[PDB]
């Protein structure tokens, strides 16, 4: 291992799973369950066969409110979904019995598609998933019904929408958790351009798993961006472990202590007490009736501080059962903890700054919207390097129905398909097990 740190790992009910695992066993670079989640998100496509059939029968293709009168085609796609799914799988696979999956859902209305990994190991990126899946379903439908040369371009529009006139698959009846590479705010951002509502949909609104999935995705992106390289690697790994994976049961135990009556302020006081207890901070100087705290390990203070911030969101937004206040928690947990201690807040002010713009862009006329439409690739919320978005995932999971743009509104197709995949839906389980399994190989 490059670092000396070990952590205790717990399950989503706050019970010990494995003691003293090397920090790097949770690294995106080493952990096989994180690998499986990333490869899975790369290669998974939700197919809306009912959507395709309705689009074709009405000629409504190419985007909102669009229709081409006279192009209607009435094809019994859902009634024949077994044969179409089987024909598409034959095209999508590389060899018989490889890792290609095609499974009908909702009685043939939806299909889960997992494109084989061998396609991605000779690809630059991830677009082979929607492109191979779209073309195999287009061809399978044409072949099913013997759609003529004259009509088949309508099946293509029904499936993949206005592409390539639009840059995106505008009006498409397939969905992925990734978005197209041209929409990245910077190179290496693709695992950050994943809507908070999609994450919460996939994890069925379970709060810890939503936080775990979100942190895994955000910190895995920090490796792809180069931010977790060299001087900063250990800071990123400790944030993953403590803010996203409930390392040492710290997030759990702060929520437990504050859930009944607590506030953001009471969470801060408990975290500062725990950091001093564990030696992460110490009194450096005494001013008038005010202790100035110091640390010899900023990456560790950051991690503790980040665990407290997640616990503070769980307490504040959990007590409201309303997600909107996450933007306020993200700001004032950090602003409060700085003046409480004399030490810098999470990500050296970057969470607080993210939260200022996120508060503004979730309560003003100029842009943004509700907490669920944000993601780490959004201009408002890209600034903290992995320490803000997982709290938003946690807040949205806790929302009892205060949002118009909720996961039910924006993420139905994703929920039905991606929640089916174990490691997407319960990643805290699989990531911990994988870490325990490789603990003596790190």
């Amino acid at each position: 291992a490059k670092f000396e740190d070990k952590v205790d790992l717990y399950d989503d009910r706050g019970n010990l799973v494995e003691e003293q695992v090397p920090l790097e066993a949770l690294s995106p670079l080493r952990n096989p369950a994180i690998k499986s989640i990333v490869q899975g998100i790369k290669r998974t496509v939700a197919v809306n066969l009912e959507g395709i059939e309705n689009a074709l029968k009405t000629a409504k293709v190419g985007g909102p409110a669009c229709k081409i009168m006279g192009r209607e085609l009435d094809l019994d796609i859902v009634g024949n979904a077994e044969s179409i799914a089987a024909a598409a799988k034959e095209m999508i696979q590389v060899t018989e019995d490889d890792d290609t999956n095609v499974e009908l859902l909702g009685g043939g209305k939806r299909a889960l598609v997992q494109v084989p990994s061998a396609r991605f190991d000779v690809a630059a990126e991830y677009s082979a998933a929607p492109l191979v899946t779209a073309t195999a379903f287009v061809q399978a439908i044409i072949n099913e019904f013997d759609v003529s040369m004259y009509d088949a371009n309508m099946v293509k529009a029904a499936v993949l929408g206005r592409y390539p006139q639009s840059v995106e698959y505008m009006g498409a009846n397939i969905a992925t958790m990734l978005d197209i590479p041209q929409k990245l705010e910077g190179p290496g951002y693709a695992l950050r351009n994943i809507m908070v509502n999609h994450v919460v949909a996939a994890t069925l609104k379970n709060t810890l798993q939503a936080a775990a999935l979100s942190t895994i995705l955000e910190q895995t992106a920090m490796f792809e961006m180069g931010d977790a390289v060299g001087a900063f690697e250990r800071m990123h790994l400790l944030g993953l472990a403590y803010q996203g994976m409930n390392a040492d049961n710290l997030v759990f135990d702060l929520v437990k202590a504050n859930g009944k009556e607590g506030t953001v302020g009471s969470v801060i006081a408990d975290l500062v007490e725990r950091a001093l207890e564990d030696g992460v901070i110490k009194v450096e100087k005494e001013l008038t009736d005010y202790k100035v705290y110091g640390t010899d390990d900023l990456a560790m203070w950051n991690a503790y501080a980040a665990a407290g911030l997640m616990a503070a969101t769980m307490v504040n937004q959990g007590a409201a059962r309303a997600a909107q206040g996450v933007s306020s928690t993200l700001l004032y947990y950090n602003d409060l903890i700085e003046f409480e201690t004399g030490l810098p807040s999470v990500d050296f002010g970057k969470v607080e700054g993210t939260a200022v713009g996120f508060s503004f862009f979730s309560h003003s006329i100029y842009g943004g919207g509700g907490p669920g439409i944000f993601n780490g690739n959004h201009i408002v919320t890209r600034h903290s390097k992995g320490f803000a978005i997982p709290c938003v995932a946690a807040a949205m999971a806790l929302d009892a129905g205060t949002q118009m743009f909720s996961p039910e509104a924006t993420s139905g197709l994703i929920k039905e398909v991606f929640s089916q995949v174990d490691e997407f839906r319960e990643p805290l389980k699989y990531v911990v097990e994988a870490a325990a399994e490789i603990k003596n190989e790190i």
């Binding site: 081409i68 371009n153 390539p164």
Partner: protein, 548 residues
């Protein structure tokens, strides 16, 4: 009767149209031309005032060794030198683009749901009217909430406003009619019934931001400007806290979740934001043009008004400036809306199809493509052969290829009622043409035309798309003159023959059925003529704020 282009040819040349010989070199060069003479004088005055040489007719080659022709704007009696049809010199052309660029369509369906379900307040036609009075004060740039706001000069932004429409006649009739695009008033009964069935109980805003702002800024400004002032107007009219959590749903709704841009954004080689010409798909351009609701008895007139709309925008402004610039591409476009030439070829094709098949009655297949596109291609090329004046007028091969293939493609789609076979007829026309005369267009003219047959019916990722959905960003079409506006006419063609109220988007169709627009979209060629005569009054000018 005569071929429709005979009058124009007789106006342009002293010789009869059939005569093969003429006189050159004795016309005095530029001195033959009222317009060139105005430009040489202007050149002199500009250079003397600023101290840097500018327009000078002795630089390079001497223009006007042949006759510098007038052009008839098709369907009009207006004859002008081609410089008066250059977009820089023609305020109608500039305003047509500004009126598209500054428009966005924004639904009120998600907004009204946030009001009822999240704020718990009622929506009625009266609350919608109060909201429309408020947003018509705010949208041009004026304040409703804060103290000590400075504001736009209402006379500078007089062209900005917001109207609404809905498929429900009883709801439409209860909203104050100053604000309502009235579908029953603007559309003939059968088209009104189609459009009202499409919209149903939906309610939609058509928002036009100020032309002065659009010119100072860009197309991507339009949806953001619209949203900020829809947002302030929601705050004011429905009496909400001025910036609370719900305000964000109105922003996300107006900016993303219920917005219809006129054009989608472009990739990096040609980086542009929304509401630029390259993002406007052919079926939307056919729907913006309003010839469909006025000229519906004559599918040729509707389809070639769309061609004029698209050839000017896509070849003159878009390919000839945004994507290139300079002297640019005036006559590559004018070939498609002048001298009644495309009209003559297209009425020939419409008559051929009427007589053999009946409109929309031909089988939708390759036998129909081969039949109709070959016949009409032979008809148009025969005219350049029969009339040397016609060949000297449309002197560039590209010009001829676009016109002949547009008549063949539109005629094919008149037969089949399907744009896809119209498009296959466009490519066949190009192949026949290239063999007939051993030439086609400019060096790079048939890049899309040689890809063209195989991609008409493809279904692959960046190849397969019904023609209505294609546009200036479809890969094969992204570079070249003499195609994009013609494809907009071909997309209109089967719908005009079928008598469909719209080609691709019924909301975009209704959004331009509005006499408060500065440009008149029911008569595009008439407006191009008015601008060429220096009789068009654009919006956006700064006279009020500059020295007398």
């Amino acid at each position: 009767a005569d071929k429709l282009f005979i009058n124009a040819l007789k106006k342009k040349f002293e010789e009869s149209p059939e005569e093969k010989k003429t006189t050159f070199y004795t016309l005095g060069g530029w001195k033959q031309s009222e317009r060139k003479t105005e430009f040489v004088n202007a050149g002199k005055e500009v250079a003397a005032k600023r101290g840097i040489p500018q327009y000078n007719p002795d630089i390079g080659t001497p223009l006007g060794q042949r006759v510098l022709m007038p052009y008839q704007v098709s369907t009009t009696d207006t004859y002008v030198e081609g410089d008066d049809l250059h977009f820089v010199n023609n305020a109608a052309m500039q305003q047509m683009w500004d009126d598209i660029r500054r428009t966005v369509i924004v639904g009120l369906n998600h907004a009204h749901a946030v009001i009822e379900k999240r704020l718990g307040k009622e929506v009625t036609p009266e609350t919608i009217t109060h909201y429309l009075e408020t947003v018509n004060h705010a949208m041009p740039g004026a304040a409703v909430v804060q103290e000590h706001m400075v504001e736009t000069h209402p006379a500078l932004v007089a062209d900005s406003y917001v109207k609404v429409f809905t498929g429900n006649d009883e709801i439409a009739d209860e909203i104050d009619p100053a604000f309502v695009i009235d579908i029953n008033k603007q559309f003939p009964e059968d088209q009104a019934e189609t459009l009202k069935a499409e919209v149903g109980d939906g309610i939609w805003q058509v928002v036009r931001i100020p032309t002065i702002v659009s010119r100072t800024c860009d197309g991507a400004t339009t949806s953001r400007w619209s949203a900020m002032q829809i947002g302030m107007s929601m705050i004011s009219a429905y009496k909400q806290a001025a910036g609370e959590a719900a305000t964000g749903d109105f922003a996300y709704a107006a900016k993303h979740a219920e917005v219809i841009h006129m054009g989608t954004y472009l990739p990096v080689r040609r980086a542009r934001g929304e509401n630029e010409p390259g993002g406007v798909p052919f079926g939307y351009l056919a729907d913006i043009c309003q010839s469909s609701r006025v000229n519906y008895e004559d599918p040729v007139r509707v389809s070639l008004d769309v061609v004029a709309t698209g050839a000017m925008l896509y070849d003159q402004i878009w390919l000839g400036s945004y994507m290139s610039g300079g002297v640019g591409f005036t006559q590559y476009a004018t070939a498609a809306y002048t001298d009644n030439i495309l009209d003559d070829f297209t009425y020939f094709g419409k008559e051929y199809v009427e007589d053999k098949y009946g409109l929309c009655e031909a089988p939708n297949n390759m036998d129909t493509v081969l039949d109709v596109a070959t016949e009409v291609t032979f008809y148009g090329l025969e005219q350049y052969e029969e009339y040397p004046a016609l060949l000297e007028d449309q002197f560039g091969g590209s010009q001829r290829a676009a016109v002949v293939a547009a008549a063949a493609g539109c005629s094919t789609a008149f037969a089949t009622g399907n744009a896809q076979t119209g498009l296959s007829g466009w490519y066949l026309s190009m192949y026949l043409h290239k063999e007939q005369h051993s030439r086609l267009g400019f060096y790079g003219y048939d890049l899309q035309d040689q890809c063209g047959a195989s991609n008409v019916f493809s279904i692959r990722g960046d190849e397969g798309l019904p023609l209505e959905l294609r546009g200036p960003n479809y890969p094969n079409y992204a570079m070249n003159v003499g195609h994009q506006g013609e494809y907009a006419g071909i997309s209109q063609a089967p719908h005009a023959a079928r008598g469909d109220a719209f080609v691709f988007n019924p909301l975009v169709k209704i959004a331009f059925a509005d006499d408060n627009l500065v440009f008149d979209f029911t008569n595009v060629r008439g407006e191009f003529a008015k601008g060429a005569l220096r009789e068009f009054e654009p919006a956006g000018e700064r006279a009020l704020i500059t020295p007398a």
